[PDB]
Coordinates of C-alpha atoms and ligand atoms in Angstrom, one line a residue:
Chain F
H1 CA 118.7 60.4 111.0
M2 CA 120.1 63.8 111.9
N3 CA 120.8 65.3 115.3
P4 CA 118.2 68.0 115.8
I5 CA 119.4 71.6 116.2
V6 CA 117.6 74.8 117.0
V7 CA 119.1 78.3 117.0
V8 CA 117.2 81.4 118.2
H9 CA 118.0 85.1 118.2
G10 CA 116.8 88.2 119.8
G11 CA 117.4 91.5 118.2
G12 CA 120.4 92.7 116.1
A13 CA 121.0 95.9 118.1
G14 CA 123.4 98.3 119.8
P15 CA 125.0 98.1 123.3
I16 CA 122.9 96.4 126.0
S17 CA 123.1 97.3 129.7
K18 CA 124.2 94.7 132.3
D19 CA 120.6 94.5 133.7
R20 CA 118.8 93.9 130.4
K21 CA 121.5 91.4 129.5
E22 CA 120.5 88.9 132.2
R23 CA 116.8 89.3 131.5
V24 CA 117.6 88.7 127.8
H25 CA 119.6 85.6 128.8
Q26 CA 116.7 84.0 130.7
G27 CA 114.2 84.5 127.8
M28 CA 116.6 83.2 125.2
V29 CA 117.5 80.1 127.2
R30 CA 113.7 79.6 127.7
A31 CA 113.0 79.8 124.0
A32 CA 115.9 77.5 123.0
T33 CA 114.6 75.1 125.7
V34 CA 111.0 75.1 124.3
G35 CA 112.2 74.6 120.8
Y36 CA 114.7 71.8 121.6
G37 CA 112.0 70.3 123.9
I38 CA 109.9 70.0 120.8
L39 CA 112.7 68.4 118.6
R40 CA 113.8 66.0 121.4
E41 CA 110.3 64.4 121.4
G42 CA 110.4 63.9 117.6
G43 CA 108.5 67.2 116.8
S44 CA 108.9 69.0 113.4
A45 CA 111.3 71.8 112.6
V46 CA 108.1 74.0 112.0
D47 CA 106.7 73.1 115.4
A48 CA 110.1 73.9 117.1
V49 CA 110.6 77.2 115.4
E50 CA 107.0 78.3 116.2
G51 CA 107.5 77.1 119.8
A52 CA 110.6 79.2 120.3
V53 CA 109.2 82.4 118.8
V54 CA 106.0 82.0 120.9
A55 CA 108.1 82.0 124.0
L56 CA 109.8 85.2 122.9
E57 CA 106.6 86.8 121.7
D58 CA 105.1 86.1 125.2
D59 CA 108.2 87.5 127.0
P60 CA 107.9 91.4 127.4
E61 CA 111.7 91.7 127.1
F62 CA 111.6 91.2 123.4
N63 CA 110.4 93.2 120.4
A64 CA 107.6 90.9 119.2
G65 CA 104.1 90.2 120.6
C66 CA 103.9 91.7 124.1
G67 CA 106.9 94.1 124.3
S68 CA 106.6 95.1 120.6
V69 CA 107.9 98.6 120.0
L70 CA 105.3 101.3 119.3
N71 CA 104.6 102.9 115.9
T72 CA 104.4 106.7 115.4
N73 CA 100.8 106.8 116.9
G74 CA 101.7 104.8 120.1
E75 CA 100.3 101.5 118.8
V76 CA 101.7 98.0 118.4
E77 CA 101.7 96.6 114.8
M78 CA 103.4 93.3 114.3
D79 CA 104.8 91.2 111.5
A80 CA 105.8 87.5 111.4
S81 CA 106.6 84.8 109.0
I82 CA 107.2 81.0 109.0
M83 CA 108.4 78.6 106.3
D84 CA 108.8 74.8 106.0
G85 CA 111.9 73.7 104.0
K86 CA 110.4 70.5 102.7
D87 CA 107.8 71.9 100.3
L88 CA 108.7 75.6 100.8
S89 CA 105.3 76.0 102.6
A90 CA 105.0 79.5 104.1
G91 CA 102.8 81.9 106.0
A92 CA 103.2 85.5 107.0
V93 CA 101.3 88.4 108.4
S94 CA 102.0 92.1 108.5
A95 CA 100.7 95.1 110.5
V96 CA 98.7 92.9 112.8
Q97 CA 97.3 94.3 116.0
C98 CA 95.4 93.1 119.1
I99 CA 96.7 89.5 119.1
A100 CA 99.2 87.9 121.4
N101 CA 101.0 85.6 118.9
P102 CA 101.5 86.8 115.3
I103 CA 103.7 83.8 114.6
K104 CA 100.8 81.4 115.3
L105 CA 98.7 83.5 112.9
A106 CA 101.4 83.2 110.3
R107 CA 101.2 79.4 110.8
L108 CA 97.4 79.4 110.3
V109 CA 97.9 81.3 107.0
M110 CA 100.3 78.6 105.8
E111 CA 98.2 75.6 106.8
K112 CA 94.6 77.0 106.6
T113 CA 94.5 79.1 103.5
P114 CA 95.5 78.9 99.8
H115 CA 97.7 82.0 100.4
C116 CA 101.1 82.8 102.0
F117 CA 100.7 86.4 103.2
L118 CA 97.8 88.3 104.8
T119 CA 97.9 91.9 105.9
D120 CA 96.2 94.3 108.3
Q121 CA 92.4 94.3 108.3
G122 CA 92.4 90.9 106.4
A123 CA 94.8 89.3 108.8
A124 CA 92.5 90.6 111.7
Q125 CA 89.4 89.0 110.0
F126 CA 91.2 85.7 109.3
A127 CA 92.4 85.6 113.0
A128 CA 88.7 86.1 114.1
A129 CA 87.5 83.3 111.8
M130 CA 90.2 81.0 113.3
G131 CA 89.1 81.8 116.9
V132 CA 92.3 83.7 117.8
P133 CA 91.5 86.0 120.8
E134 CA 91.2 89.7 120.2
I135 CA 93.0 91.3 123.1
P136 CA 93.2 95.0 124.2
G137 CA 96.3 96.8 122.8
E138 CA 97.5 98.0 126.1
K139 CA 98.3 94.4 127.0
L140 CA 101.0 94.4 124.3
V141 CA 102.2 97.9 125.3
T142 CA 104.9 98.2 128.0
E143 CA 106.1 101.2 130.0
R144 CA 109.6 100.6 128.6
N145 CA 108.3 101.1 125.1
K146 CA 106.2 104.2 125.9
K147 CA 109.5 105.8 127.1
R148 CA 111.5 104.7 124.1
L149 CA 108.8 106.2 121.7
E150 CA 108.3 109.5 123.6
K151 CA 112.1 110.0 123.5
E152 CA 112.7 109.0 119.8
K153 CA 110.2 111.7 118.9
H154 CA 112.3 114.4 120.7
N155 CA 117.0 98.4 116.1
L156 CA 116.4 96.0 119.0
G157 CA 114.8 92.9 120.4
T158 CA 113.4 91.3 117.2
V159 CA 113.1 87.5 117.4
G160 CA 113.6 84.5 115.2
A161 CA 114.4 80.8 115.1
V162 CA 115.8 78.1 112.7
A163 CA 115.7 74.4 113.3
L164 CA 116.7 71.1 111.8
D165 CA 114.6 68.1 112.9
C166 CA 115.5 64.4 113.2
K167 CA 113.6 63.7 109.9
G168 CA 115.9 66.1 108.1
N169 CA 113.5 69.0 107.7
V170 CA 114.5 72.6 108.2
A171 CA 112.4 75.7 109.1
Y172 CA 112.5 79.3 110.2
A173 CA 110.3 81.7 112.1
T174 CA 110.7 85.5 112.4
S175 CA 108.4 88.0 114.3
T176 CA 108.7 91.6 115.2
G177 CA 107.0 94.8 116.4
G178 CA 109.3 96.6 113.8
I179 CA 111.2 99.8 114.5
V180 CA 110.2 102.4 117.1
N181 CA 108.3 105.4 115.7
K182 CA 107.8 103.7 112.3
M183 CA 105.0 105.1 110.2
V184 CA 101.5 103.6 110.4
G185 CA 101.4 100.5 108.2
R186 CA 105.2 100.2 107.8
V187 CA 106.1 96.6 106.8
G188 CA 109.7 95.4 107.6
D189 CA 111.6 92.4 106.4
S190 CA 110.2 90.0 108.9
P191 CA 107.1 88.8 106.9
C192 CA 108.9 88.8 103.6
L193 CA 110.3 85.4 102.3
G194 CA 113.9 85.6 101.3
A195 CA 114.4 88.7 103.5
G196 CA 113.2 88.0 107.0
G197 CA 114.1 84.3 106.6
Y198 CA 114.2 81.4 104.2
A199 CA 114.1 77.7 104.7
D200 CA 114.8 74.9 102.2
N201 CA 115.6 71.3 102.9
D202 CA 118.0 71.2 100.0
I203 CA 120.2 74.1 101.5
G204 CA 119.3 75.1 105.0
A205 CA 117.3 77.7 107.0
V206 CA 118.1 81.4 107.9
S207 CA 116.4 84.0 110.1
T208 CA 117.6 87.6 110.0
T209 CA 117.4 90.7 112.1
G210 CA 118.6 94.4 111.9
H211 CA 117.6 97.3 109.6
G212 CA 114.6 95.8 107.8
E213 CA 114.8 98.1 104.8
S214 CA 118.4 97.0 104.1
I215 CA 117.5 93.3 104.6
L216 CA 114.6 93.6 102.1
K217 CA 116.8 95.4 99.6
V218 CA 119.5 92.7 99.5
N219 CA 117.2 89.7 100.2
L220 CA 119.5 88.9 103.1
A221 CA 118.2 85.4 104.1
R222 CA 118.0 83.9 100.6
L223 CA 121.4 85.6 99.7
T224 CA 123.0 83.8 102.6
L225 CA 121.6 80.5 101.2
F226 CA 123.0 81.4 97.7
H227 CA 126.5 81.5 99.2
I228 CA 126.0 78.1 100.9
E229 CA 124.8 76.7 97.5
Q230 CA 128.1 77.9 95.9
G231 CA 130.0 75.8 98.5
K232 CA 130.8 78.4 101.2
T233 CA 130.6 77.2 104.9
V234 CA 127.8 78.7 107.0
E235 CA 130.1 81.2 108.6
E236 CA 131.7 82.2 105.3
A237 CA 128.2 82.6 103.8
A238 CA 126.9 84.8 106.7
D239 CA 130.1 86.9 106.6
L240 CA 129.7 87.5 102.9
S241 CA 126.0 88.2 103.0
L242 CA 126.2 90.6 105.9
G243 CA 129.3 92.0 104.3
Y244 CA 127.4 92.8 101.2
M245 CA 124.5 94.5 103.1
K246 CA 127.0 96.8 104.8
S247 CA 128.8 97.7 101.6
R248 CA 125.9 98.0 99.2
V249 CA 123.2 99.6 101.3
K250 CA 125.0 100.6 104.6
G251 CA 122.8 98.4 106.7
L252 CA 123.8 96.4 109.8
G253 CA 122.1 93.3 111.2
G254 CA 122.6 89.7 112.1
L255 CA 121.5 86.3 111.1
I256 CA 121.3 82.7 112.4
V257 CA 121.6 79.8 110.0
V258 CA 121.5 76.0 110.1
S259 CA 122.6 74.0 107.0
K260 CA 121.0 70.8 105.7
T261 CA 123.9 68.9 107.2
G262 CA 123.5 70.4 110.7
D263 CA 126.2 73.1 110.6
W264 CA 125.1 76.3 112.3
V265 CA 126.3 79.8 113.2
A266 CA 125.1 83.1 114.6
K267 CA 126.8 86.1 112.9
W268 CA 126.2 89.8 113.1
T269 CA 127.6 93.2 112.1
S270 CA 125.6 95.1 114.7
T271 CA 127.0 95.7 118.1
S272 CA 125.1 92.9 119.7
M273 CA 122.8 90.0 118.9
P274 CA 121.4 87.8 121.6
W275 CA 121.4 84.2 120.5
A276 CA 121.1 80.7 121.8
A277 CA 121.7 77.3 120.2
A278 CA 120.8 73.8 121.3
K279 CA 122.5 70.7 120.0
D280 CA 123.9 67.5 121.4
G281 CA 122.3 68.2 124.8
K282 CA 124.4 71.4 125.1
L283 CA 123.2 75.0 125.2
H284 CA 125.4 77.6 123.5
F285 CA 124.7 81.3 124.3
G286 CA 126.0 84.8 123.6
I287 CA 125.2 88.5 123.1
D288 CA 128.6 90.1 122.3
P289 CA 131.4 88.8 120.0
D290 CA 132.9 85.6 121.6
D291 CA 131.3 86.1 125.0
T292 CA 129.9 82.7 124.2
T293 CA 129.3 80.1 126.9
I294 CA 128.3 76.4 126.6
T295 CA 126.2 74.7 129.3
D296 CA 124.5 71.3 129.7
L297 CA 120.8 70.8 129.0
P298 CA 119.3 68.6 131.7
Chain G
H1 CA 126.5 105.1 77.1
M2 CA 124.0 102.2 76.7
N3 CA 121.2 101.9 74.1
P4 CA 118.1 102.1 76.3
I5 CA 115.3 99.5 76.4
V6 CA 112.0 98.9 78.0
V7 CA 110.2 95.6 78.3
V8 CA 106.6 95.4 79.5
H9 CA 104.4 92.5 80.4
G10 CA 100.6 92.3 80.8
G11 CA 100.4 89.2 83.0
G12 CA 100.7 85.4 82.6
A13 CA 97.4 83.8 81.6
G14 CA 95.5 80.8 80.4
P15 CA 94.2 81.0 76.9
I16 CA 93.1 84.6 76.0
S17 CA 89.9 85.3 74.0
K18 CA 90.3 86.4 70.4
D19 CA 88.6 89.8 70.8
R20 CA 90.5 90.6 74.0
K21 CA 93.8 89.9 72.1
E22 CA 93.3 93.0 70.0
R23 CA 92.8 95.4 73.0
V24 CA 95.6 93.7 74.9
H25 CA 97.9 94.2 71.9
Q26 CA 97.0 97.9 71.8
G27 CA 97.6 98.3 75.5
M28 CA 101.0 96.6 75.4
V29 CA 101.9 99.0 72.6
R30 CA 100.7 102.1 74.5
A31 CA 102.7 101.2 77.6
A32 CA 105.9 100.3 75.8
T33 CA 105.8 103.5 73.7
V34 CA 105.2 105.5 76.9
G35 CA 108.2 103.8 78.6
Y36 CA 110.5 104.1 75.6
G37 CA 109.4 107.8 75.0
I38 CA 110.6 108.7 78.5
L39 CA 113.9 106.9 77.8
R40 CA 114.2 108.8 74.6
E41 CA 113.9 112.1 76.5
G42 CA 117.0 110.7 78.3
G43 CA 114.8 109.9 81.3
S44 CA 115.7 107.5 84.0
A45 CA 114.9 103.7 84.1
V46 CA 112.7 104.3 87.2
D47 CA 110.7 107.1 85.3
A48 CA 110.3 104.7 82.4
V49 CA 108.9 101.7 84.3
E50 CA 106.7 103.9 86.4
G51 CA 105.1 105.5 83.3
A52 CA 104.8 102.2 81.5
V53 CA 103.0 100.6 84.5
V54 CA 100.8 103.8 85.0
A55 CA 99.4 103.4 81.5
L56 CA 98.5 99.8 82.2
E57 CA 97.0 100.7 85.6
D58 CA 94.8 103.2 83.8
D59 CA 93.8 100.7 81.0
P60 CA 90.7 98.8 82.2
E61 CA 91.8 95.7 80.2
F62 CA 94.7 94.9 82.6
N63 CA 94.6 93.5 86.1
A64 CA 96.1 96.6 87.9
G65 CA 94.7 100.0 88.9
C66 CA 91.4 100.4 87.0
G67 CA 90.4 96.9 85.9
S68 CA 91.9 95.0 88.9
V69 CA 90.3 91.6 89.7
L70 CA 87.9 91.6 92.7
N71 CA 88.5 90.0 96.1
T72 CA 85.9 87.8 97.9
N73 CA 84.0 90.9 99.0
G74 CA 83.7 92.2 95.4
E75 CA 86.3 95.0 96.1
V76 CA 89.6 96.1 94.6
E77 CA 92.7 95.8 96.8
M78 CA 96.0 96.6 95.0
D79 CA 99.7 95.7 95.3
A80 CA 102.7 97.4 93.7
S81 CA 106.5 97.8 93.9
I82 CA 109.3 99.6 92.1
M83 CA 113.1 99.3 92.5
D84 CA 116.1 101.5 91.5
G85 CA 119.0 99.3 90.6
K86 CA 121.6 102.0 91.3
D87 CA 121.5 101.8 95.1
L88 CA 118.6 99.2 95.4
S89 CA 116.2 101.9 96.7
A90 CA 112.7 100.6 96.6
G91 CA 109.1 101.3 97.4
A92 CA 106.1 99.0 97.7
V93 CA 102.5 99.1 98.8
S94 CA 100.1 96.2 99.5
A95 CA 96.3 96.0 99.9
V96 CA 95.7 99.6 99.0
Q97 CA 92.2 100.8 98.0
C98 CA 90.4 103.6 96.2
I99 CA 93.4 105.1 94.4
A100 CA 94.1 105.2 90.6
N101 CA 97.8 104.5 90.5
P102 CA 99.3 102.2 93.2
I103 CA 102.7 102.3 91.3
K104 CA 102.8 106.0 91.8
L105 CA 102.3 105.5 95.5
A106 CA 105.0 102.9 95.6
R107 CA 107.3 105.5 94.1
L108 CA 106.3 108.0 96.8
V109 CA 107.1 105.4 99.4
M110 CA 110.6 105.0 97.9
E111 CA 111.2 108.7 97.6
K112 CA 109.4 110.4 100.5
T113 CA 109.7 107.9 103.4
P114 CA 112.6 106.3 105.2
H115 CA 110.7 103.0 104.5
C116 CA 110.3 100.6 101.6
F117 CA 106.9 99.0 102.2
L118 CA 103.5 100.4 103.4
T119 CA 100.2 98.4 103.7
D120 CA 96.4 98.8 103.8
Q121 CA 95.4 101.6 106.3
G122 CA 98.9 103.0 106.7
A123 CA 99.3 103.3 102.9
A124 CA 95.9 105.0 102.6
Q125 CA 96.9 107.6 105.3
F126 CA 100.2 108.2 103.5
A127 CA 98.3 108.6 100.2
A128 CA 96.0 111.2 101.6
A129 CA 99.0 113.1 103.1
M130 CA 100.8 113.1 99.7
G131 CA 97.6 114.5 98.3
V132 CA 96.6 111.4 96.3
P133 CA 93.0 111.5 95.2
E134 CA 90.5 109.2 96.8
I135 CA 88.6 107.7 93.9
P136 CA 85.3 105.7 94.3
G137 CA 85.8 101.9 94.7
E138 CA 83.2 101.4 92.0
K139 CA 85.2 103.4 89.4
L140 CA 88.0 100.7 89.6
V141 CA 85.4 97.9 89.1
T142 CA 84.7 96.7 85.6
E143 CA 81.6 94.6 84.5
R144 CA 83.7 91.6 83.3
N145 CA 85.4 91.6 86.7
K146 CA 82.1 91.7 88.5
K147 CA 81.2 88.7 86.3
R148 CA 84.5 86.9 86.8
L149 CA 83.9 87.0 90.6
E150 CA 80.3 85.5 90.1
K151 CA 81.7 82.6 88.0
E152 CA 84.2 81.9 90.9
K153 CA 81.6 82.4 93.7
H154 CA 79.2 79.8 92.1
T155 CA 99.0 91.7 86.4
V156 CA 101.5 94.1 84.8
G157 CA 105.1 95.1 84.9
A158 CA 108.0 96.7 83.2
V159 CA 111.8 96.6 83.3
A160 CA 114.2 99.2 81.8
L161 CA 117.8 100.0 81.1
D162 CA 118.4 103.8 80.8
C163 CA 120.9 106.0 78.9
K164 CA 123.4 105.9 81.9
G165 CA 123.2 102.1 82.3
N166 CA 120.7 102.1 85.3
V167 CA 118.1 99.5 85.5
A168 CA 114.7 99.4 87.2
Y169 CA 111.5 97.3 87.5
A170 CA 107.9 98.1 88.4
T171 CA 105.0 95.7 88.9
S172 CA 101.3 96.3 89.7
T173 CA 98.4 94.0 90.3
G174 CA 94.9 93.6 91.6
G175 CA 95.9 90.0 92.7
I176 CA 93.7 86.9 92.1
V177 CA 90.0 86.6 91.6
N178 CA 88.1 85.8 94.9
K179 CA 91.2 86.3 97.1
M180 CA 90.8 86.5 100.8
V181 CA 90.6 90.0 102.2
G182 CA 94.1 91.4 102.8
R183 CA 95.8 88.7 100.8
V184 CA 99.2 90.0 99.6
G185 CA 100.9 88.3 96.6
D186 CA 104.4 88.4 95.2
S187 CA 104.0 91.7 93.3
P188 CA 104.9 94.1 96.1
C189 CA 107.6 91.8 97.6
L190 CA 111.1 92.8 96.6
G191 CA 112.9 89.8 95.1
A192 CA 109.7 87.9 94.2
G193 CA 107.5 90.1 91.9
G194 CA 110.7 91.8 90.7
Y195 CA 114.3 92.9 91.5
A196 CA 116.7 95.5 90.1
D197 CA 120.5 95.7 90.5
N198 CA 122.8 97.6 88.2
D199 CA 125.4 94.9 88.7
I200 CA 123.2 92.3 87.1
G201 CA 119.9 93.4 85.6
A202 CA 116.3 93.7 86.4
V203 CA 113.3 91.3 86.4
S204 CA 109.5 91.7 86.7
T205 CA 107.4 88.6 87.2
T206 CA 103.9 87.3 86.8
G207 CA 102.0 84.1 87.6
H208 CA 100.9 82.3 90.7
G209 CA 101.7 84.8 93.5
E210 CA 102.4 82.3 96.3
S211 CA 104.7 80.2 94.0
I212 CA 106.6 83.3 93.0
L213 CA 107.1 84.2 96.7
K214 CA 108.1 80.7 97.7
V215 CA 110.9 80.5 95.1
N216 CA 111.7 84.2 95.2
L217 CA 111.6 84.1 91.4
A218 CA 112.9 87.5 90.4
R219 CA 116.1 87.1 92.6
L220 CA 116.6 83.5 91.5
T221 CA 116.6 84.5 87.8
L222 CA 119.3 87.2 88.5
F223 CA 121.4 84.6 90.5
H224 CA 121.6 82.5 87.3
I225 CA 122.7 85.6 85.3
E226 CA 125.4 86.2 87.9
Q227 CA 126.6 82.6 87.3
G228 CA 127.1 83.3 83.6
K229 CA 123.8 82.1 82.2
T230 CA 122.3 84.0 79.3
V231 CA 119.1 85.8 80.2
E232 CA 117.1 83.1 78.2
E233 CA 118.9 80.3 80.0
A234 CA 118.4 82.1 83.4
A235 CA 114.7 82.6 82.7
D236 CA 114.2 79.0 81.7
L237 CA 116.0 77.6 84.8
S238 CA 114.1 79.8 87.3
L239 CA 110.7 79.2 85.7
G240 CA 111.6 75.5 85.4
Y241 CA 112.5 75.4 89.1
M242 CA 109.2 77.1 90.0
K243 CA 107.4 74.4 88.0
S244 CA 109.3 71.3 89.3
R245 CA 109.6 72.4 93.0
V246 CA 106.3 74.2 93.9
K247 CA 104.1 73.3 90.8
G248 CA 103.8 77.0 89.9
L249 CA 103.4 78.5 86.5
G250 CA 104.2 82.1 85.5
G251 CA 106.3 84.3 83.4
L252 CA 109.0 87.0 83.4
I253 CA 110.7 89.9 81.6
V254 CA 114.4 90.6 82.2
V255 CA 117.0 93.1 81.0
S256 CA 120.7 92.7 81.8
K257 CA 123.1 95.5 82.4
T258 CA 124.5 94.7 78.9
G259 CA 121.0 95.3 77.3
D260 CA 120.1 91.7 76.5
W261 CA 116.5 91.0 77.2
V262 CA 113.8 88.3 77.1
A263 CA 110.2 87.6 77.8
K264 CA 109.6 83.9 78.8
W265 CA 106.7 82.1 80.4
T266 CA 105.4 78.6 81.5
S267 CA 101.7 79.8 81.7
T268 CA 99.9 79.4 78.3
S269 CA 100.2 83.1 77.4
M270 CA 101.8 86.3 78.5
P271 CA 101.3 89.6 76.6
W272 CA 104.7 91.3 76.3
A273 CA 106.3 94.1 74.4
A274 CA 109.8 95.4 74.1
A275 CA 111.3 98.6 72.7
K276 CA 114.9 99.0 71.7
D277 CA 116.7 100.7 68.8
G278 CA 113.6 102.3 67.3
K279 CA 111.7 99.1 67.0
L280 CA 108.8 97.5 68.9
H281 CA 108.6 93.8 69.6
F282 CA 105.3 92.2 70.7
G283 CA 103.9 88.8 71.5
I284 CA 101.3 86.9 73.5
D285 CA 101.8 83.3 72.4
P286 CA 105.2 81.5 72.2
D287 CA 107.0 81.3 68.8
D288 CA 104.8 84.2 67.6
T289 CA 106.4 87.6 67.6
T290 CA 105.7 90.8 65.6
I291 CA 108.3 93.5 65.0
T292 CA 107.2 97.0 63.9
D293 CA 109.0 100.3 63.5
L294 CA 108.7 102.8 66.4
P295 CA 108.7 106.5 65.4
Ligands
LIG1 N1 114.1 93.6 111.0 C1 113.1 94.3 111.8 C2 113.8 95.1 112.9 C3 115.0 94.3 113.6 O1 115.2 93.1 113.3 O2 115.7 94.9 114.4 C4 112.2 95.2 111.0 O3 112.7 96.0 110.3 O4 111.0 95.1 111.1
LIG2 N1 101.3 87.4 90.6 C1 99.9 88.0 90.8 C2 98.9 87.3 89.8 C3 99.3 87.6 88.4 O1 100.5 87.6 88.0 O2 98.3 87.6 87.5 C4 99.4 87.7 92.2 O3 99.2 86.6 92.6 O4 99.2 88.7 93.0
LIG3 NA1 107.7 89.9 123.5
LIG4 NA1 94.2 98.7 84.5

């Protein structure tokens, strides 16, 4: 039975200040720790990836859940998707408001409906039916995001996870507030299977980040898995898939991947991509190209 | 330059009633002749698929625009997408209400916004701002659809190659009878309900929405074409995979950048039509095709 692995990412963005960098570090380490804590007890890849993304959704330092960027009208609208590589089971929500954890809604769509993808008013009503708390919007809004919007008028922090569990299952989760000053009802790549992520026990799992429009246009996550299918290593596949997005549609971004055999990488063409990985009782972490450290998990 | 082509589909289906077959036939003909006409004016592949789908939206016989199936509240909520194979520009809308032509709004998303996908209330606000008429919800609802929903409470597309070698797809749907409010299927999702890439070809799909999403059917098909499969082989592998992996049935239409095309399906039926070299090809049931001249 396989050694479990989890990889998590923040946002495929530009330069990050020294200060934000350490806050970003704590939250990523926390999310890797939650996800690996799940796998180390015999939990499922789905459970682990959900666990990690919840930790980042809850953390204000990240563009998902609380700390989501604001749309054009100063409101938080969130997307999330989750997928189980065994049966290709999947759930997703887009343009969801007034809930703490869109990824958990995505999960309820997967397991509690005959559908994969709920949007807006319908996602709100389903959440209500499943007892998910409706919270005031200002709880998701942060001062940092008010400032970013107000300025943009006169990208960063998006979150995701992939895992391989001891039973040989793979999974991904992705969740976002989108891009600042997006139009009302703009859907990005995060809830769209094949773009925001893809997971398949017979290949591996991918979660992506960056310019969502570009990601959707190339189907970045499933494209990366295509390269793995052809026999490329995980790094070669990421290089080639991100390479193609840059050439064809001029978009930058980043991805994490874990293969069916436990190989894994984080790769980006943006300036930075916060990422953490947990395997063999060791924690791997970076933000910039080869600033990587390895540290012991308790 | 290339000989242009348009292929249209009117949705994977169980067995279709005899009387219905005639009106479906006529609908398929009107859409394909509309698409091909635009191509004959030397129009673009995107113009061609848009017009082809617009006709089917307006035709109450087909599950898109007027004549869309009804969700669990007896209402019409529509999904559409369109893709330009040249640079992979795209536009999509999901869960839109009270407009005649979701495919036209998907094209506005592609052309007038920095985005690729708008949904529900955002899409409605964008529609108003583009000056799209708000049409009564009841005007999209047909009697047979009201009666389809009662029986449960007790999809169209096009691909084209143009005269400069550019490909496109468009797909529009009302979704599935009795669907949860705000359910979004494969139709508006790039790579699932369709894909277009000048380096390969273009696909539009139909069938079980969730299954088509899970296997990313449009993109999967093109992957096979990249690998050297004929369009027919590619369509059979991808549909075969959907069936064996997720127990989903459906159909698809595909045109390559060479101008080879095919309509295949694992559902019982799929109305389809294709126009190329002054001739019109039409079918609903497998091993049963009719070829007429096209003025
Ligand atoms: N992919 C996200 C943004 C990001 O990952 O930075 C979106 O477009 O919604
Ligand atoms: N694919 C459509 C259904 C159909 O093709 O008829 C949907 O589920 O939204
Ligand atoms: Na957050
Ligand atoms: Na119609």
